[PDB]
Amino acid sequence: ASVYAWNRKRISNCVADYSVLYNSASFSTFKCYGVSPTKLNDLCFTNVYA
Amino acid sequence: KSWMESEFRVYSSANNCTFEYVSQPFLMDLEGKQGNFKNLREFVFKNIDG
Numbered sequence A: 001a002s003v004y005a006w007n008r009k010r011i012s013n014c015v016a017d018y019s020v021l022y023n024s025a026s027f028s029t030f031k032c033y034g035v036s037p038t039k040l041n042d043l044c045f046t047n048v049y050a
Numbered sequence B: 001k002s003w004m005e006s007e008f009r010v011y012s013s014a015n016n017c018t019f020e021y022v023s024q025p026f027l028m029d030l031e032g033k034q035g036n037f038k039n040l041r042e043f044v045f046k047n048i049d050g
């Protein structure tokens, strides 16, 4: 999608796979402004948007 | 010479729906027997801590 109409997905009730997104050597940079990228599998959330 | 389910009016306004769950599709008896019953159902519902 584009910035004028961005699609949002509701991914719920599933075990995440942050280990793949952590070490992938495909994206440019992580540099994400929330919580620490390390040990992301320890914390647990209710819902995550896409 | 069979019974078919046609009316599905259980829901009318299909708004933004949250996480849904499905099961394996199957086919029940779908026939009207007379006389005496043969079994009973029991479903205890409870909402504690979500």
Ligand SMILES: *[C@@H]1O[C@H](CO)[C@@H](O)[C@H](O)[C@H]1NC(C)=O
Residues within 6 Å of the ligand: B016, B017, B018
């Ligand atoms: C649908 O969207 C409205 C407007 O954002 C919101 O108030 C409502 O909670 C949503 N319904 C859901 C998430 O089931």
